[PDB]
Amino acid sequence: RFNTNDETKRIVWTQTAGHCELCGTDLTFDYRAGKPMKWGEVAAILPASPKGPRGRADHDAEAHTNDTANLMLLCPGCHDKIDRDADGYPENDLSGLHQAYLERIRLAATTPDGGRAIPLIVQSQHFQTINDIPVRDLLTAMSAEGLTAFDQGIKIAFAAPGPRGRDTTYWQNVKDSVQYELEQQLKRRGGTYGDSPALAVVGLADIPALMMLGQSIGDRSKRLIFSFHREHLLRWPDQSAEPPSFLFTPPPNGDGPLALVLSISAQVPVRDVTDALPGARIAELSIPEPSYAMVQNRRVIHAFRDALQIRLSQLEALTPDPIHVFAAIPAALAIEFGALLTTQHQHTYLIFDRDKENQDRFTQTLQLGP
Amino acid sequence: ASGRFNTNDETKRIVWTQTAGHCELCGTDLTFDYRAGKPMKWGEVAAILPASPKGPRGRADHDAEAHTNDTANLMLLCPGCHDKIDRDADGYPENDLSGLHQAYLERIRLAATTPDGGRAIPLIVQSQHFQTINDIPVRDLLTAMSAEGLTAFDQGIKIAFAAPGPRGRDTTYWQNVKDSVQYELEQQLKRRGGTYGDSPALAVVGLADIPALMMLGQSIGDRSKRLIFSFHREHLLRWPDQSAEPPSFLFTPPPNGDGPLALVLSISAQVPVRDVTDALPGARIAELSIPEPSYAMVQNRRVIHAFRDALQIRLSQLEALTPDPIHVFAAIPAALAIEFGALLTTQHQHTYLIFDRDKENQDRFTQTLQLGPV
Amino acid sequence: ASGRFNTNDETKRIVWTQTAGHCELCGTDLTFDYRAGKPMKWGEVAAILPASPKGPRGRADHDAEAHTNDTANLMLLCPGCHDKIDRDADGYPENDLSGLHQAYLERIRLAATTPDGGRAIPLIVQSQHFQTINDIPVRDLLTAMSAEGLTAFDQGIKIAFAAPGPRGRDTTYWQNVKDSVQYELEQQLKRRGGTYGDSPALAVVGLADIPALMMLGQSIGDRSKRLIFSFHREHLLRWPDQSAEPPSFLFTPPPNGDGPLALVLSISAQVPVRDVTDALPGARIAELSIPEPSYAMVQNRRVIHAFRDALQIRLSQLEALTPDPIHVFAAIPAALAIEFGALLTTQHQHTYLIFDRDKENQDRFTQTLQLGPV
Amino acid sequence: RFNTNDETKRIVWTQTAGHCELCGTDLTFDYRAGKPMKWGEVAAILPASPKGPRGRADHDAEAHTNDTANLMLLCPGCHDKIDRDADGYPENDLSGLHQAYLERIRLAATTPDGGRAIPLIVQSQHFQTINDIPVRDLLTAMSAEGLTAFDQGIKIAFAAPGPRGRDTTYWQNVKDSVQYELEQQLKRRGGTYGDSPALAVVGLADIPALMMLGQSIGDRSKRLIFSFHREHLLRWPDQSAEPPSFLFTPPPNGDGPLALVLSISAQVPVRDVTDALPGARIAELSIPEPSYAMVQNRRVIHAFRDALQIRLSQLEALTPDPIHVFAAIPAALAIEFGALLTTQHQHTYLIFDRDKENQDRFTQTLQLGP
DNA sequence: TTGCTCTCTTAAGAGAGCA
DNA sequence: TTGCTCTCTTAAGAGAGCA
Numbered sequence A, D: 001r002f003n004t005n006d007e008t009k010r011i012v013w014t015q016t017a018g019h020c021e022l023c024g025t026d027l028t029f030d031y032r033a034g035k036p037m038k039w040g041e042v043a044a045i046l047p048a049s050p051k052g053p054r055g056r057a058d059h060d061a062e063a064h065t066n067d068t069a070n071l072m073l074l075c076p077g078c079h080d081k082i083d084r085d086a087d088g089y090p091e092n093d094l095s096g097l098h099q100a101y102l103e104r105i106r107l108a109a110t111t112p113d114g115g116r117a118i119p120l121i122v123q124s125q126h127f128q129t130i131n132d133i134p135v136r137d138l139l140t141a142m143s144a145e146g147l148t149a150f151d152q153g154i155k156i157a158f159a160a161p162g163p164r165g166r167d168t169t170y171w172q173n174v175k176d177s178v179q180y181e182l183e184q185q186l187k188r189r190g191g192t193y194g195d196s197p198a199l200a201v202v203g204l205a206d207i208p209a210l211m212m213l214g215q216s217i218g219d220r221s222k223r224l225i226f227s228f229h230r231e232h233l234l235r236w237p238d239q240s241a242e243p244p245s246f247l248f249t250p251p252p253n254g255d256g257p258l259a260l261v262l263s264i265s266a267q268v269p270v271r272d273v274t275d276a277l278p279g280a281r282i283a284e285l286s287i288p289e290p291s292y293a294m295v296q297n298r299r300v301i302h303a304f305r306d307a308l309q310i311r312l313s314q315l316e317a318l319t320p321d322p323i324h325v326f327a328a329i330p331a332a333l334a335i336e337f338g339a340l341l342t343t344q345h346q347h348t349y350l351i352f353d354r355d356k357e358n359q360d361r362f363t364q365t366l367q368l369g370p
Numbered sequence B, C: 001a002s003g004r005f006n007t008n009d010e011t012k013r014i015v016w017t018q019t020a021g022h023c024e025l026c027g028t029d030l031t032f033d034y035r036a037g038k039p040m041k042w043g044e045v046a047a048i049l050p051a052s053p054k055g056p057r058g059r060a061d062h063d064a065e066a067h068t069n070d071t072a073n074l075m076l077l078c079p080g081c082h083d084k085i086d087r088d089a090d091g092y093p094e095n096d097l098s099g100l101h102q103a104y105l106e107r108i109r110l111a112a113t114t115p116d117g118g119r120a121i122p123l124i125v126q127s128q129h130f131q132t133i134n135d136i137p138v139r140d141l142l143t144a145m146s147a148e149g150l151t152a153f154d155q156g157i158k159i160a161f162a163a164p165g166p167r168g169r170d171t172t173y174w175q176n177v178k179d180s181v182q183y184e185l186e187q188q189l190k191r192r193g194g195t196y197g198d199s200p201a202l203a204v205v206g207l208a209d210i211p212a213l214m215m216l217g218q219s220i221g222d223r224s225k226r227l228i229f230s231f232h233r234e235h236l237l238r239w240p241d242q243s244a245e246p247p248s249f250l251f252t253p254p255p256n257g258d259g260p261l262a263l264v265l266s267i268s269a270q271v272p273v274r275d276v277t278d279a280l281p282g283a284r285i286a287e288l289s290i291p292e293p294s295y296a297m298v299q300n301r302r303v304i305h306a307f308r309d310a311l312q313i314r315l316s317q318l319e320a321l322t323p324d325p326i327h328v329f330a331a332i333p334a335a336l337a338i339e340f341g342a343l344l345t346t347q348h349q350h351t352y353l354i355f356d357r358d359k360e361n362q363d364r365f366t367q368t369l370q371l372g373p374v
Numbered sequence E, F: 001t002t003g004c005t006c007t008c009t010t011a012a013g014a015g016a017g018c019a
């Protein structure tokens, strides 16, 4: 009268795919000694007797015996803990975690196949804080779009700056990581992924480095860009958001050096460009409200790309000398920027960045080009 | 076409579980009957099919029975999809579906293992004063973490900022604060785990003077899996309301002139201008406020994120106007002070001078902290 | 001296468990009575004492009751040691023992958590031929791993070396072998875990031609937590005898001359010299053997380690004699071929030319692999 | 008649310190929600009925009901698995793991306090294989000698060589890791460890780098050297082994450059020294049977140190020009070698190493000195 | 040759009486 | 004011009869 029947336990195992709803462990197999076994327990949130953990007098136990909204698949340890600390694992909290777990499974089961890609994380250590993109979050963002991979992918972390800051040694190391380490790790995959597998790539690293990354993978391989967002991590903030307008101001005439100022994350003060590059003729690409949060979805990235491609060809047509780049842009845009410099734009680009060893002044770092 | 693949009931249960009970080609939930109060006829609402052929036609180019012996190579399909799969007379597909099937299984597994992505470090940071009058026990953070899917696996970190000596909150004092936090944080983020070896998430709450909270933000940054929690006078560590929409952050630009630039943040309460100009003579005041300032305004974490997004938009505008330092007079909740410090951790740095209210001098605004190019 | 500290029975149980039932000052096992068939008088054979004083004399300079409230700050002592601890009238020590007590607890915890240091990756590597005639199922490695404290947490890796095409086992072939192993190995060693975030141990067994086994050794190296397992014709993956002492590795130096230098390893069987000189005309033979060559000689893992130690001592002597390549003719078990390849992974590299017996050409010795400066 | 009594369950919890004998998890506390709870199970290896897992007709269940040799403390998941796969978890294997677990606890409980130290792991990536010293194994070797720490310590991993091999950039990076990263991480500890805490240090890294490490920590701090061993990992192979004899051959007279050849791990061929340093006058320190396995215990390291200190002063007395070092030595000896070069020996030492980019020839790398 | 039921097994926390 | 016993609770795998 109180016992959950076999059909329902089957349903509970099915709808959870046989993992513990609270810790995620696989409950269909013992990896230690190698035997398939169903070592999980079907657990009641609200108990039969009102004197059990989370018990209530107003709970019709008979009416809810085979109510899968009351039943979780738990490993025996999780189940033992939740029944020993009802105040710490209350009904509202368990039911909410239960429902959310089930919905993530249902959405994965209804996502159509969208192909395969190599996950690629590239991150620096030039910040004074930890900088770490979780692998699970990239793979989960891939999976929400139907994309899967044969392994957890490549994760490259640049060496930190040494005692002299971002000196020539540092930039040599950045280069070696992008142009040697990355390539050696793509080759070690062999044919696992094929001839030209796609790269599902997310960066959070020096702006010059990310532009170099972009240039290196631009034609080399097909690319699916993802983005780290302060609020939403690897999830796109809002798939329905419309891209902003990319405003452009052309440079003035003259012989002075040509500068391309990109004010997307923030407004780059012109005083800081003329300090670093006296006599500069400034061209500027910006959005109406510069913001760190603006990479709302992948169409924002493409629209940036489409807008900048147009203007780069224009700017190259003006001078034979390098274009000097001063950029306050999100990391995903930095990668797309470099991917445009592959062959479409074979002019020399000298990339300035903020220099903590020179009181936040812009200084020259990397040169991108033919 | 033609044949059907024989399975026993143990194999059915295993296939139904690894696929979560949906057709691998169209995604229909095959537990519909049970949800409708009808008995599950498990063998009638689904077909089980090996994912790979035996070989050319139905001619084993390999040990086909040794591959289908693995339940991992068996698919679940609704009958309509099964009927569109041409097969030989033993039930094996004529064409290979192994790629699509293994991709389906990976997507279910990544969803089923998502709870282990909650592995977390608890971190409570208080000033000696709030530790005495308003101690936050680790238990209170853990149950708030747990309700959100965050799971600690070792003791939590609870730090109390030492009070200052005679030198005051000087540069050495703030550097030892930062080192103390990053030391504990780094040792616990070496404790990787889960399915992919990811570093644990950080679950952090603070209650201290606003400049110390900003230094906690400086220490943790905003480029890692981190979740701020918030102490609330009425709801303690539980969010007052997960459905509340963030307020509008109103902004009043500074008047024009050469006086020092002040950023007044009137979020907890309305800061009077005379208190600002007493401490900073000639100040030119810019103000970020909300329509109804309130100590209780942190209804959920989206409010913290929305404050940071509006704050950063206005900081860009202000820094455009002048290279000189920005003098910060903040009436904000503790969670917003943390996120303010964390925002200011990019390579780019502008000078910010943080004014605290001196509880031992009439609550007078007092400069205790400088962030930025030094 | 004087006072005693009151504890209830729940607190006693907690202190007895966190200390494993020994005195924290002298280490005596306080469960002696139970081991002797006598009833445990838990409150008589031990004293429980806070580790830290209340303050000067027995004068709380702090909330002493708030600290002893934590059972983690309570010590277990035998009565004789307790009697040597001068105390105040509430039972608190007069002098601070917190450091010694917390160090004791850490040592017990590091021992109690030692099972999680067994986290492991299973790896089975075979040639297509041995996979067909002598497949090693993952289950057999797992139960041998488990019996030794090694615990896998995901599916094991089982690799089969592709057979060579018309180009033979050329440089490209051996590089793809190495890449294939290091690819799988690296992805699974990213899966850190346990108490400290350590990478998992590797548990590896191989059955393939000796040159391929040496390349597996080249791929895994010998500078990480790795445990070789061994297939044995009679004991399968279980060690025949954990108490067996390794045999003596006998060595016969090469005669003097200018002929090519050959290293003959007669461990599984005695290699006839004419087989060596057929393949390598003019060879100058050095030989490492054991007294009674036998296919069954890998009784335990110490035998593998002892072979490597004797082998390396003799390789140093041989390489001293000539800069020219060393030509290797090995009759050794599979586990010894793996460890031989792993030995040769330092920065220093001498040229080694490995001869295999061609099963499709009368078992003729044939050079298939070159290791070293290329 | 069959039930384990409360005294014995108490004994089982006590002697295991309340952790799962098979997975090591803490069974006295729920870290997720914060409540102390005893969530483990006292488990029988041989069961009551002979029809249970590992059952046997010849097992007197009544005689062994409170036999702690038959009872393990297990988490509920481990206990559920071992009872579902008796063939995979047989009596002999469980009993052996049980006994070993208990003995590790007893030895930790009887180890006297031996002070505190900062664990320090330093490892390179210049090998073509993974190179990774487990933290647990250093902390366990420390604990066997009574030493404990407040944290798991410092673990530095040098950047890998880039595409040019061990070039000037590589060696700059090694320097920065030893002289900047290490120091910044010792300072971040603050007063946690005191003014001059000791370093419990183990290296596995380039010989030149380890000598630089040694020179940097030699006087800076008190040092407890540990060693990675191919067979025994961080455990000392044999605490009763006697040190070998360190044989010395003095250099010949002449004006040629002075070389110090160290043949400890292996015999360094003289042909390789005269190739790199024509006209070299070779002095040699060696043991009678060079071997990778020779670091049997810490007295072997001290005896090497004592023998080399004597000879370095002699060699410095011979020339005013640098001493050129060609060394095939274990990693722990490389660290002790450098620690002697702090002030006792203020002559210039030029360190040669094997060069994979020059066909295994010795080439000059780092210069150690005043 | 399941594939629903009711008994059985194994662990544990109360509850009573007593210590 | 434990601090040994026997009942109670919750999960599960057989075992029987039948489907």
Ligand SMILES: Nc1ncnc2c1ncn2[C@@H]1O[C@@H]2COP(=O)(O)O[C@@H]3[C@H](O)[C@@H](COP(=O)(O)O[C@H]2[C@H]1O)O[C@H]3n1cnc2c(N)ncnc21
Binding pocket: A204, A205, A206, A207, A228, A229, A230, A265, A266, A267, A268, A269, A291, A292, A327, A328, A329, A330, A331, A332, A334, A354, B222, B223, B224, B345, B346, B347, B348
């Ligand atoms: N006057 C000016 N005002 C403001 N910024 C200015 C400037 N002049 C230059 N800049 C630079 O523009 C970049 C804006 O920051 P961003 O976040 O929009 O983009 C960054 C960038 O693409 C890359 C490297 O960061 P950094 O080197 O600090 O460069 C900063 C900053 O110095 O990683 C992105 N990034 C950093 N931290 C992140 C996080 N937590 N989450 C997500 N993406 C993050």
Ligand SMILES: Nc1ncnc2c1ncn2[C@@H]1O[C@@H]2COP(=O)(O)O[C@@H]3[C@H](O)[C@@H](COP(=O)(O)O[C@H]2[C@H]1O)O[C@H]3n1cnc2c(N)ncnc21
Binding pocket: B134, B207, B208, B209, B210, B231, B232, B233, B268, B269, B270, B271, B272, B294, B295, B329, B330, B331, B332, B333, B334, B335, B337, B357
């Ligand atoms: N004109 C002005 N009028 C009103 N305030 C003004 C001001 N000009 C500046 N301020 C400052 O704005 C902060 C508002 O108070 P708050 O409560 O919203 O946020 C505080 C703050 O973030 C941090 C340190 O407190 P304090 O130094 O008093 O800072 C005050 C106050 O000095 O901890 C938070 N905090 C304190 N006690 C808390 C509790 N019990 N529960 C939860 N959070 C608590």
Ligand SMILES: Nc1ncnc2c1ncn2[C@@H]1O[C@@H]2COP(=O)(O)O[C@@H]3[C@H](O)[C@@H](COP(=O)(O)O[C@H]2[C@H]1O)O[C@H]3n1cnc2c(N)ncnc21
Binding pocket: C134, C207, C208, C209, C210, C231, C232, C233, C268, C269, C270, C271, C272, C294, C295, C329, C330, C331, C332, C333, C334, C335, C337, C357
């Ligand atoms: N004059 C000479 N006389 C005898 N052998 C001679 C020789 N000159 C060279 N040799 C080689 O010495 C190896 C001895 O055999 P082994 O069994 O001790 O070790 C083998 C080897 O390590 C690897 C590949 O086998 P193979 O290529 O035949 O190598 C043979 C043989 O060619 O796998 C191991 N292996 C094979 N089958 C196994 C099994 N069933 N169980 C367990 N381990 C097994």
Ligand SMILES: Nc1ncnc2c1ncn2[C@@H]1O[C@@H]2COP(=O)(O)O[C@@H]3[C@H](O)[C@@H](COP(=O)(O)O[C@H]2[C@H]1O)O[C@H]3n1cnc2c(N)ncnc21
Binding pocket: C222, C223, C224, C345, C346, C347, C348, D204, D205, D206, D207, D228, D229, D230, D265, D266, D267, D268, D269, D291, D292, D327, D328, D329, D330, D331, D332, D334, D354
């Ligand atoms: N003619 C010659 N013959 C043999 N060696 C010669 C030589 N001329 C130079 N040498 C060098 O002497 C060192 C001997 O090896 P070693 O192991 O005794 O000591 C090493 C060393 O101290 C440091 C860097 O290693 P590496 O740069 O390869 O230097 C090698 C080798 O190139 O790490 C130690 N190390 C490496 N791997 C280890 C492991 N798995 N376990 C434990 N410690 C390990």
Ligand SMILES: [Zn+2]
Binding pocket: A020, A021, A022, A023, A024, A025, A074, A075, A076, A077, A078, A079
């Ligand atoms: Zn669980």
Ligand SMILES: [Zn+2]
Binding pocket: B023, B024, B025, B026, B027, B028, B077, B078, B079, B080, B081, B082
């Ligand atoms: Zn379908």
Ligand SMILES: [Zn+2]
Binding pocket: C023, C024, C025, C026, C027, C028, C077, C078, C079, C080, C081, C082
């Ligand atoms: Zn004692």
Ligand SMILES: [Zn+2]
Binding pocket: D020, D021, D022, D023, D024, D025, D074, D075, D076, D077, D078, D079
């Ligand atoms: Zn366990």
